[PDB]
Each structure stands twice: as structure tokens, then as C-alpha cells.
């Protein structure tokens, strides 16, 4: 694991540090890395970074962004985390694009996201947290969908579940429902200017139907994930049993 084993193509994001698209010298494989400067970190914080990286390395699944390697450049006090390159980028940018272009996404694409994220979620629960939010969902070059490592103040918590408003794997189902709803409608199911107003809308549990281009069957399952009672939301298993979900909606190598 050395930095010289890879060549940077270009930077794809800056924030935490920066994310760059890179090329593995030995075989030409295209990857990315997260570049983190740990020079200002205490031993404690550096220690919580080690454990974190250890947690990233323990989850291997087709619908979870894959970790490849960790590289320490103790000279520039930089740590690189090497991960898979997702050519389609993140889902938040896809929604924004639809919103700005005034173009809804195909039902087929929504089903692929539902199927593959529900499988990612199933694997997360099996192990036991990674945020179910558009910015943390990635698309590769083969129609596959993968959950990233985000989560694993200023903002409105659009996706918080009713039971989290005050006090559960069913809560993850609510968040997935919010995500799929936003993918369809291009806006979250509950919106407001403050968290208090938001909590008011969430408690009432009312929202618009997703657009009419989407089947009553898809509207139905998203609506069930958004039930106020956690025990009326479908489990991972009940979601995957839905007649909408077919083999082609799953991942393929
Ligand atoms: C911080 C970063 O986090 C992740 C990034 C990726 N990731 C892997 N391949 C990527 C390709 C991306 O877009 C490329 C350039 C622009 N075009 C339009 C699309 C291809 C964007 C993110 C990608 C995977 C996992 C994570 C993670 N934290 O788990 C991130 C997160 C959300 C949006 C943007 C970024 C980035 F910093 F990479 F830009
Ligand atoms: Cl529109
Ligand atoms: Cl209602
Ligand atoms: Cl709404
Ligand atoms: Cl795959």
C-alpha cells in the first residue's frame, strides 16, 4: 500500500479533505481515493479513525461501496482511503438534475434503487450506521446502486422518522421510503422551513401522491414505508416479495 502505486487523474470533490479519481498502475484499474490530512488530529481522534476504517473494511456486498486499501503518507501526514469508482455519481445529483431539467426518472430506475438499497439495508441489519440519503447512494457503470459510508446542524432533517422525533430497523424503512419518494417526486414527502414545522408535518403523516406516471403499485409500497406506525411498515423481506421487483432490478457484474 503506497501512494506511488497509483496515479491521480483528477479531483472529483473537495470538502473532510478531497476525493480524487485515480488509476492503479499495475493493471490500469480505475478507482477513487479520499485524501485526509490527519496532522491536526489528536491521538484519540486518530484512534477513532483507525476503528472507522476497520469498520469500512468488514462489509463486503455488491450494493455497498467497496473499500480497497488504506495508504498512510506519514510525510505529508495524509491518509488515503481507496474505494470503487462509481461512474454515475451520487443520487442527490441525479435528483437535482431532474429538478432543474424538469424531467422525472423512469419507474424502472426507481425499482432498481428500491431493490438494491433494500438489499444493502438487509446486509447492514444482518451485521448489526450508514445514512440512507441521496448523497450517500452511488451508481456504477452497469446499472448498479451502492450505499456509501456517510454516517458510518444547519440542515433540515427531512428523513427523520416519527419515532425518532422522540425516541429500530423499521426506522430505516421510513428513511428509505423518503428517499424513494424524493426520487419519484423530485422533492421530499415532508418539507418545511424549520425543524419544528417539519416535525408537525411528519406527525400528521400526510403527503402528495407520487406523480401519476408511477404505477399505483409503486405508490402503494412507498406509501406503506411512510406509515406513521413502525409496525405497519413492510420489512426488508416484505419489500422484496413485492411483485414489482424482478431479477433484472438486482445487481449484475
Ligand atoms: C466524498 C465522496 O464520497 C464518496 C464518493 C464515491 N464515489 C466513487 N466514484 C464517484 C464518482 C462521482 O462522480 C464522478 C465525477 C462526476 N460525474 C458526474 C460522476 C462520476 C461522485 C462520487 C463517487 C463513492 C463513495 C463515497 C462515500 N463517502 O462513501 C462524495 C459523496 C457524494 C457526492 C460526491 C462525492 C465526491 F467527493 F467524490 F465528489
Ligand atoms: Cl417536473
Ligand atoms: Cl394519513
Ligand atoms: Cl408532499
Ligand atoms: Cl455488482
**Rounded Cα–Cα distance for residues 233 and 229 (Å):** 7
Same domain, 149 and 77: no
Closest CA to 155 of 97, 196, 186, 195: 195
Domain count, the chain: 2
Q: How far is CA 215 from the centre of its chain?
A: 24
- Three-state DSSP at 237 gives helix
Find the helix or strand (DSSP H, E) in which 19 lies.
strand 18-24
Same domain, 57 and 144: yes
Domain housing 10:
1-42+66-86
For residue 235, the 8-state DSSP code is P
Same domain, 133 and 31: no
Closest CA to 59 of 122, 2, 1: 122
CATH of the domain at 176: 1.10.510.10
Q: Is 246 in the pocket of ligand 1 (CB under 6 A)?
A: no
In angstroms, what is the resolution? 2.0
CATH of the domain at 38: 3.30.200.20
**Rounded Cα–Cα distance for residues 58 and 80 (Å):** 17
69 flagged as catalytic:
no
- Three-state DSSP at 181 gives helix
**Rounded Cα–Cα distance for residues 207 and 96 (Å):** 20
**Rounded Cα–Cα distance for residues 24 and 46 (Å):** 27
Catalytic residue among 131, 149, 172, 216: 131
Q: Is 87 in the pocket of ligand 1 (CB under 6 A)?
A: yes
**Rounded Cα–Cα distance for residues 86 and 77 (Å):** 27
Ligand 1 atom 16 nearest Cα: 89
For residue 116, the 8-state DSSP code is H
Which grid cell sits at 32? 477513487
**Rounded Cα–Cα distance for residues 79 and 49 (Å):** 10
For residue 252, the 8-state DSSP code is -
Closest ligand 1 atom to Cα of 18: 37
- Determine phi and psi for 169, rounding to 5 degrees: -65, -25
Same domain, 55 and 2: no
Amino acid at each position: 500500500s503506497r501512494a506511488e502505486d497509483y496515479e491521480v487523474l483528477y479531483t472529483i470533490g473537495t470538502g473532510y479533505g478531497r476525493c480524487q479519481k485515480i488509476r492503479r498502475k499495475s493493471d490500469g484499474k480505475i478507482l477513487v481515493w479520499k485524501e485526509l490530512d490527519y496532522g491536526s488530529m489528536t491521538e484519540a481522534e486518530k484512534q477513532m479513525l483507525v476503528s472507522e476504517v476497520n469498520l469500512l473494511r468488514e462489509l463486503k456486498h455488491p450494493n455497498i461501496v467497496r473499500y480497497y486499501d488504506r495508504i498512510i503518507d506519514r510525510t505529508n501526514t495524509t491518509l488515503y482511503i481507496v474505494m470503487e469508482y462509481c461512474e454515475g455519481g451520487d443520487l442527490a445529483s441525479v435528483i437535482t438534475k431532474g429538478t432543474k431539467e424538469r424531467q422525472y426518472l423512469d419507474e424502472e430506475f426507481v425499482l432498481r434503487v428500491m431493490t438494491q438499497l433494500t438489499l444493502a439495508l438487509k446486509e447492514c441489519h444482518r451485521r448489526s450506521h450508514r445514512d440512507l440519503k441521496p448523497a450517500n447512494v452511488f451508481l456504477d457503470g452497469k446499472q448498479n446502486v451502492k450505499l456509501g459510508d456517510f454516517g458510518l446542524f444547519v440542515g433540515t432533517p427531512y428523513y427523520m422518522s416519527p419515532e425518532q422525533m422522540n425516541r429500530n430497523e423499521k426506522s430505516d424503512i421510513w428513511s428509505l421510503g423518503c428517499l424513494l419518494y424524493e426520487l419519484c417526486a423530485l422533492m421530499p414527502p415532508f418539507t418545511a422551513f424549520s425543524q419544528k414545522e417539519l416535525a408537525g408535518k411528519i406527525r400528521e403523516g400526510k403527503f402528495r401522491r407520487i406523480p401519476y406516471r408511477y404505477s399505483d403499485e409503486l405508490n402503494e409500497i412507498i406509501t406503506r414505508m411512510l406509515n406513521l406506525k413502525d409496525y405497519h411498515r413492510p420489512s426488508v423481506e416484505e419489500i422484496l416479495e413485492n411483485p414489482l421487483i424482478l431479477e433484472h432490478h438486482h445487481h449484475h457484474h
